[PDB]
Scaffold this motif. Sequence first.
Motif, PDB file in Angstrom:
ATOM      1  N   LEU A 150      40.685  10.774   4.429  1.00  0.00           N
ATOM      2  CA  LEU A 150      39.791  11.964   5.008  1.00  0.00           C
ATOM      3  C   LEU A 150      40.408  13.343   5.395  1.00  0.00           C
ATOM      4  O   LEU A 150      40.074  14.378   4.984  1.00  0.00           O
ATOM      5  N   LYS A 151      41.480  13.051   6.076  1.00  0.00           N
ATOM      6  CA  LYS A 151      42.460  13.965   6.635  1.00  0.00           C
ATOM      7  C   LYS A 151      43.106  14.936   5.511  1.00  0.00           C
ATOM      8  O   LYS A 151      42.996  15.954   5.363  1.00  0.00           O
ATOM      9  N   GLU A 152      43.436  14.089   4.354  1.00  0.00           N
ATOM     10  CA  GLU A 152      44.186  14.500   3.111  1.00  0.00           C
ATOM     11  C   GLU A 152      43.142  15.315   2.362  1.00  0.00           C
ATOM     12  O   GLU A 152      43.530  16.627   1.916  1.00  0.00           O
ATOM     13  N   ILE A 153      42.185  15.279   2.154  1.00  0.00           N
ATOM     14  CA  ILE A 153      40.963  15.676   1.483  1.00  0.00           C
ATOM     15  C   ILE A 153      40.755  16.899   2.118  1.00  0.00           C
ATOM     16  O   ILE A 153      40.676  17.959   1.874  1.00  0.00           O
ATOM     17  N   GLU A 154      40.620  16.741   3.571  1.00  0.00           N
ATOM     18  CA  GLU A 154      40.217  18.031   4.470  1.00  0.00           C
ATOM     19  C   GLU A 154      41.511  19.103   4.241  1.00  0.00           C
ATOM     20  O   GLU A 154      41.300  20.257   4.064  1.00  0.00           O
ATOM     21  N   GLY A 155      42.640  18.796   4.185  1.00  0.00           N
ATOM     22  CA  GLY A 155      43.935  19.604   3.837  1.00  0.00           C
ATOM     23  C   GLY A 155      43.782  20.099   2.422  1.00  0.00           C
ATOM     24  O   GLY A 155      43.966  21.418   2.442  1.00  0.00           O
ATOM     25  N   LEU A 156      43.342  19.381   1.579  1.00  0.00           N
ATOM     26  CA  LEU A 156      43.433  19.988   0.156  1.00  0.00           C
ATOM     27  C   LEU A 156      42.012  21.094   0.194  1.00  0.00           C
ATOM     28  O   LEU A 156      42.416  21.975  -0.542  1.00  0.00           O
ATOM     29  N   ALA A 157      40.748  20.558   0.765  1.00  0.00           N
ATOM     30  CA  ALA A 157      39.766  21.665   0.911  1.00  0.00           C
ATOM     31  C   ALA A 157      40.163  22.944   1.493  1.00  0.00           C
ATOM     32  O   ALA A 157      39.843  24.084   1.040  1.00  0.00           O
ATOM     33  N   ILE A 158      40.758  22.827   2.716  1.00  0.00           N
ATOM     34  CA  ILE A 158      41.295  24.175   3.377  1.00  0.00           C
ATOM     35  C   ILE A 158      42.276  24.905   2.352  1.00  0.00           C
ATOM     36  O   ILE A 158      42.296  26.166   2.581  1.00  0.00           O
ATOM     37  N   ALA A 159      43.064  24.262   1.703  1.00  0.00           N
ATOM     38  CA  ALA A 159      44.117  24.649   0.905  1.00  0.00           C
ATOM     39  C   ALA A 159      43.652  25.660  -0.183  1.00  0.00           C
ATOM     40  O   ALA A 159      43.898  26.716  -0.584  1.00  0.00           O
ATOM     41  N   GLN A 160      42.291  24.979  -0.813  1.00  0.00           N
ATOM     42  CA  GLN A 160      41.611  25.629  -1.806  1.00  0.00           C
ATOM     43  C   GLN A 160      40.756  26.964  -1.326  1.00  0.00           C
ATOM     44  O   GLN A 160      40.814  28.107  -1.988  1.00  0.00           O
ATOM     45  N   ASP A 161      40.415  26.798  -0.025  1.00  0.00           N
ATOM     46  CA  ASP A 161      39.663  27.881   0.575  1.00  0.00           C
ATOM     47  C   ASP A 161      40.706  28.984   1.021  1.00  0.00           C
ATOM     48  O   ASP A 161      40.398  30.393   0.892  1.00  0.00           O
ATOM     49  N   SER A 162      41.998  28.685   1.218  1.00  0.00           N
ATOM     50  CA  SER A 162      43.133  29.742   1.404  1.00  0.00           C
ATOM     51  C   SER A 162      44.033  30.067   0.120  1.00  0.00           C
ATOM     52  O   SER A 162      44.978  30.633   0.366  1.00  0.00           O
ATOM     53  N   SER A 163      43.364  29.788  -0.934  1.00  0.00           N
ATOM     54  CA  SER A 163      43.863  30.362  -2.407  1.00  0.00           C
ATOM     55  C   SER A 163      43.145  31.484  -2.770  1.00  0.00           C
ATOM     56  O   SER A 163      42.076  31.563  -2.948  1.00  0.00           O
ATOM     57  N   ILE A 164      43.919  32.553  -3.092  1.00  0.00           N
ATOM     58  CA  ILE A 164      43.454  33.956  -3.572  1.00  0.00           C
ATOM     59  C   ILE A 164      42.831  33.642  -4.998  1.00  0.00           C
ATOM     60  O   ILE A 164      41.898  34.250  -5.552  1.00  0.00           O
ATOM     61  N   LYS A 165      43.224  32.595  -5.806  1.00  0.00           N
ATOM     62  CA  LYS A 165      42.774  32.311  -7.221  1.00  0.00           C
ATOM     63  C   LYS A 165      41.244  31.954  -6.807  1.00  0.00           C
ATOM     64  O   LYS A 165      40.511  31.937  -8.001  1.00  0.00           O
ATOM     65  N   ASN A 166      40.947  31.016  -6.019  1.00  0.00           N
ATOM     66  CA  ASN A 166      39.571  30.830  -5.562  1.00  0.00           C
ATOM     67  C   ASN A 166      38.846  31.948  -4.895  1.00  0.00           C
ATOM     68  O   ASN A 166      38.074  31.682  -4.029  1.00  0.00           O
TER      69      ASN A 166
END
Lengths: 394, 390, 401, 401
Positions: free
Chosen positions: C215-231
């Motif tokens: 759950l922590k790993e998926i949370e890190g991945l989700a916030i990384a996607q939101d912190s990506s200019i490409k998204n």
Amino acid sequence: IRTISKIELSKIHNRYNLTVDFFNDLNVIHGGKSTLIHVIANIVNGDFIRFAFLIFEEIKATYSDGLKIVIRRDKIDEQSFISVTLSNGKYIKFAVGEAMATVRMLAMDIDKFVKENELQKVRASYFPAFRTMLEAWSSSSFYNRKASAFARELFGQFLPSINYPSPMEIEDRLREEIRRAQLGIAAYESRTFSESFVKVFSALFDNGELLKEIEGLAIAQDSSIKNGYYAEYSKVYEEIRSLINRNVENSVSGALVVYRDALRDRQDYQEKAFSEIDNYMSSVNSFLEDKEMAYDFYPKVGLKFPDGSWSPIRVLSSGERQLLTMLYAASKMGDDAIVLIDQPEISLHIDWQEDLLKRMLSQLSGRQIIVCTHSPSIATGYEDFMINISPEFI
Amino acid sequence: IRTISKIELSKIHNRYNLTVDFFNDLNVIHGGKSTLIHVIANIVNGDFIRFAFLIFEEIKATYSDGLKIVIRRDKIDEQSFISVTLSNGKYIKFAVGEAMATVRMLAMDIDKFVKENELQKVRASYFPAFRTMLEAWSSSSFYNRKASAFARELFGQFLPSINYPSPMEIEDRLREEIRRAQLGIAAYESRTFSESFVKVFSALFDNGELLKEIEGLAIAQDSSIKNGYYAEYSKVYEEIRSLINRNVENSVSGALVVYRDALRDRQDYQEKAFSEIDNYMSSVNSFLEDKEMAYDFYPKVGLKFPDGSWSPIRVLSSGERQLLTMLYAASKMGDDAIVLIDQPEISLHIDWQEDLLKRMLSQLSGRQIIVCTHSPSIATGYEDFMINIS
Amino acid sequence: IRTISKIELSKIHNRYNLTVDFFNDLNVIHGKNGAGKSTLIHVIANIVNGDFIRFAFLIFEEIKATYSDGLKIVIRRDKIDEQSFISVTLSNGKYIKFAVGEAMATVRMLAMDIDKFVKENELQKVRASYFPAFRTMLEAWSSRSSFYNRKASAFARELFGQFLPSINYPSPMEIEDRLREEIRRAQLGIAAYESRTFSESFVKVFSALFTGELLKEIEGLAIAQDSSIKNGYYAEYSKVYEEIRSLINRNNSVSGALVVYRDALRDRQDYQEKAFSEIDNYMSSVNSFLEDKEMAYDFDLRRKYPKVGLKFPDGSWSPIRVLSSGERQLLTMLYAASKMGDDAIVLIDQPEISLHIDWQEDLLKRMLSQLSGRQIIVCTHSPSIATGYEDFMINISPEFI
Amino acid sequence: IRTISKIELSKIHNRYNLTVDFFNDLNVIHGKNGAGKSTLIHVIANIVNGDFIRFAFLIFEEIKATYSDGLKIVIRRDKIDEQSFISVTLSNGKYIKFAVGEAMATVRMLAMDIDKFVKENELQKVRASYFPAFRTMLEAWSSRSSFYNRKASAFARELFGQFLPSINYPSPMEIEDRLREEIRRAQLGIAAYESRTFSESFVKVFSALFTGELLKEIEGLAIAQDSSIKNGYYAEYSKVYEEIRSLINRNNSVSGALVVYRDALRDRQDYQEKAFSEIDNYMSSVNSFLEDKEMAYDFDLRRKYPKVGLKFPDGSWSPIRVLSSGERQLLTMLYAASKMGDDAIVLIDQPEISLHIDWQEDLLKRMLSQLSGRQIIVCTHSPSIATGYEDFMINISPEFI
Ligand SMILES: Nc1ncnc2c1ncn2[C@@H]1O[C@H](COP(=O)(O)OP(=O)(O)OP(=O)(O)O)[C@@H](O)[C@H]1O
């Protein structure tokens, strides 16, 4: 040199013929006269590309040195062609439509042909009949194609190139000749100094009238415009006179004679170097009365009035400028050519017309002159050289 | 000559104030610099009209002779008015809006003002940062004005008029100087001629080492390229020494001394006539390695390659035409001006960069030089002359 | 690819020879002023482009040109029977002999013969990009692309001589347009990967159906996607993650749902990095010089044709044309050594025009670190351009005859 | 938007007056030759475009111009003190008085004054597209875009008079290129929708986890997606459907998986239809005229940039330029009345040039059914153009002085 001897036209404009035999010297033509001069001009210049704009059959062009130029325009398969044939037999043939397109590789072919056969050895200076207005239009070598193109557009695509020297070119050529003459005098100065040294050096070992002669030579040198760089001859002569009077060996007489010879030879070489320029200026000045053309020692060359104020050459009217250019063209300072004049009796008083041909011949350049005139004042006193053109109309 | 001493830039571009310290000799601007250079050229050249294209407030230019110039772009009723005031209170006012249209009367009045108070006594040769392309463009006074208009449409209206010399101009100026030199030598021969005679005439009434000196003088004179119209000094020497063998009066000794002095003075004036040219060509040939700029006699001015074949000056690279122009502009034969060079280190191998300023000073033209370079190699050693603007 | 191996000039301007052996990667050329360096670069550009018609404007005898794949183009100019001719001869032997005067006339059928020759043979496919020494002023005169350059070529050739090669160096407008197209192609690739991943994810879990750390790993991945200019068009990953977390917290297959989401997120992220690898590497390499701002892109919603421009720390954007000449030169040169360009040989006259000393220290470092593999040839006079590359220095000493 | 409401000319050509009241939607204008209808359309075009510099070539006294939003542009030409001047006056009162001779000299600072005037006020943002009556020969003479037309404008103005408005009508190359960009924009929208749908699908099934009829329905949807031209880069739906069906057949939650996939497919299909609604409606409306072939698009097996051209029943494609003038006119006019264009006023002189009578009967029907809301003004002499629009007919009867 090479001068034209005979022109044999045949069915120019498909209506009349003509055949004229020339003299190597002056040729006064009285009586399609300007058209005849254009044909002569375009052959001597070697600008054969204009003859695809004139309707004829055959034009022989015989020089004095034996050379022969036979131009011929024939129409085969409703296509016109020009077949220029020389003395040696090198016939050349190009299509007319090529020429008309180029005006608005072919030109490169003509120059190579003409140069190889030594045909443009002698140039031709053409003086058009509309030069008076033409120089006004150029009031503003760079005016040799532009002005030519303008004149050809106005008077037809058969008009030869305009080569006659403009007064700016005349002034610049006079300046360059003055520079070259000065350099020659300097070289002569160096040689005389070396020669005078060795001369006395030998006859030193050998063991009033001359003073007067040297005084005359010295004051002549001081009274010479060409000596605009050094005029101390009177001063040094008096120093020599002071040296003599205070105290006569044979070597002293030798020193006297060598000074007289040095002055005389320097003076004589000056006259020889400036011979051409002075003869041309004197011949021009034999007409002008208000002022006189001369030079000042970048040495200025211009008109000089008796008041002492100078003026550039462009102050002259059209009448004087025509006189300037034509007399230049028959002078040795020009380029070896045949002087082709359409109408010299423009803006000229009758007195100058009486003596125009006289001065041009008296310059003794040897160049061939051919003038077409209608006035009897131009042609008077030269009845033996007049040629009457009466073309046979068929 | 007149030089600059002090400039006071006040609020140019509304966010920059700077003052600078000058001298009368070489001032390498080390390190906005480009803008300062342009402001110096437009004050010196008297082209005050250009200041209507600059957003500034006030600039004071102080000379070395006490003359001071003040420029003020005042603002009244949404319209800018340039005021130019001299040290003696010479005020000429003109609107900027009127000026812009005329560029695309006013200029005539301005140059009248310049000439009447004599602000154009000393010009300024501007060496920009784009000389290579522009010089090639001109190569294909008339060149100066035309190229300036093209340049100002490319990099800005306020750009000073390009008037640094071109190799074509350099070639023509060298040719003219040789012509004047020949005339001078010719006049001296005439003078020498008459005067030598009266000396010998005096020697008549006055009652081996010298021969060797005369022979050495003759060998030097004959082998000199400057003697393109007489070269037989060896032959006449042979004739004179032959006469000695055939044949001691003091008049003979007087003749020998007068010959010796005539040759020495002829050579000395010959050397001195070709001084403003020979110094320049010695400076140039100290840089060039496989070529050599020389002259020949109508005179010919071109490079002399070691095989002996010639070539015109236009066959030079992009880094050698630059060196010619900068060295010529600091020569005594070049026109006196306050040369302003922008980035001298363009297209120059670092060895030439070290030795450039040294040669330009050693010619001793007595002219103020202001260069602005980013390269330390241009100004190495000359830490004293450095003027940091900061 | 094809790299130069050896150039053997002979009696250029009938006075001097030279013989240089090159390296496939980088060639730093230094020599005395006026020793014929710009002439060498011009010869290389006109040979590699296959524009042999320019060689009827240079006086020489023979110029061999050696590639890496074995080709041995031998050009030769002879004045047999007082007529000059150029006889370019390749390895296979198809000599093409024409008269010089034909070429000079053509400039001011022959071109078709040259074109037929080059297309049939292996002379093109390289297209050497030439960076002239006057490019700084040249771009000002054009204010052009790598293929719309007849006007600029004619202007430059008229100014500096009829032997001057064509001006191929990519203008900033072309760089911007190419960046837009690459962004467009990358977005479509992301969409294609999205469709395929959606199909695969569906079938997988559906069949194999019949935790704090993940759950922590998926949370890190989700916030990384939101912190990506490409998204930029979608940043809802945190919200949906909290919805699934709320579903879990209120009360086998749950473990299966966790692992497939982690694989889906990681593979989507990794494919994003791979797709945007070239653009991000190029932008980072450029940004290693610039300090005031940084170049980047925006995937703003409610409008299309995503902008590419400068971005300042204040947040205000600006187009690429805002850049001065000094920055613009860095942009163009670094593009030519980037993978986003065209496979070519980078021919630079002077890589130090309008450049501060700091940028000259690191220009070659960034250009090499992009690892395009293209051959780079620079002629420099500064020691800062060439420092740290002593093994790649080439000394031009033209032997005189 | 802004539509004309009333036009009050006064002494056009110094001989006759006229006063016309318009409708906001459609205006059919019928009369006779020499009554000044083409002159009226030119006046309207030069006012709405804000190209006031053309009005120094027409002899008149006063021209009122009334919009629908209340604006009352009053231009007036007076010859006070034997000097002519043009005094355009708007509602707020910003008169801009200039001398006529300035304008005529400028054509062969003034433009900057016009630009400053129009931008400050609310006169632009409309950009009326003018379709001249001689467009048929003009396109043939040019075989251009809506903004690269200085050459074509000067030619047309020289032929028909210096009062002729600028030529803005979209050339087929521009229409094709805009269609490509619209396809690209639609594709980007599909990509954005793809990302959002993937996130939504995940959370959906994840929660509701904890049949023959639905399989047939999903099979129909899958084969429809494979039979859709818009899915030219992903057509794997039949394969994945058979894999899930094979999984089911070999052996509650399964029903839940079926229904969520059906909803996902239907919403994906519906958004595809919604995104391509405008393009498909325009293409269908055009295809309702054409009979020999039909316009459509192809999503290629190449790298990118899907081709758009004519497609014949034999299967051979052809570019848009193959079309004659008659078909090309239909293409351009129907684009100008479509939602895919730019918000403007469609100014048509004669909608019957190079048109068969059948197409004239139904041109306005398709044009109105697109439901753009833009104002259309046609000058016709045929009763087939005007049939079924009796309420919108306008009779021009000018009043001579
Ligand atoms: N038309 C020509 N005729 C004869 N020699 C020429 C000609 N053009 C150039 N040269 C000579 O050939 C060489 C070519 O010079 P080039 O401009 O290539 O030098 P470079 O070393 O690249 O210069 P730089 O580094 O200053 O840019 C020079 O030595 C020049 O003098």
